[PDB]
């Protein structure tokens, strides 16, 4: 070989040392959102029992049978709230992933003639405790967990039935 080959080798070493990386932030966000999903999954029993024994969905954490929203917290979750039978979880505003800072995800259920189906996805709202339909959360806010930061199973629309 000669000097040109060595220079090319050094250039290739620099090229390899200055390479790019894929988007691992999405995977870390999914891993951190799994905790919020697990925390929100634990309030299903109380809401279901109240609905079965009273005929209407709970309107607040008080008669649902759970603690204050500010007390249901984890490493990356800061609040879990129940409103008209809908469970919503909010992530922390610091020491967490940048993409899922102060964002919300929701869980809700619909009653069938022989079963009760549960859904998971972007935030939804219910207007009346005796209603059977849901809609989108808001149009004047940006506190929605992106599709890229959710598992493929936890991607449901408000019109799903
Ligand atoms: C428990 O949640 C119920 C939905 C609520 N009931 C009503 O709001 C009435 O049906 C009028 O809509 C109860 O008042 C709640 N009980 C409490 C807060 O102690
Ligand atoms: O009242 P909740 O338990 O839903 O928590 C409220 C929180 O402090 C910010 O909305």
Numbering used by the authors: 1 to 161
Article excerpt on this structure:
Typically, the type IV pili are helical polymers constituted of one protein component, the major pilin. Type IV pili not only serve as multifunctional organelles allowing the adherence to host cells and the auto-aggregation of these bacteria, but also play an essential role in their pathogeneses. Molecular dynamics of the whole pilus with GATDH and G3P for a period of 1µs showed the overall stability of the structure. As previously described, the PilE monomer contains a 4 strand beta-sheet region, and an N-terminal melted alpha helix that forms the core of the type-IV pilus. Immune evasion against antibodies targeting type IV pili is thus attributed to the structural diversity present among strains, including variations in pilin sequence, sugar type, and phosphoform.
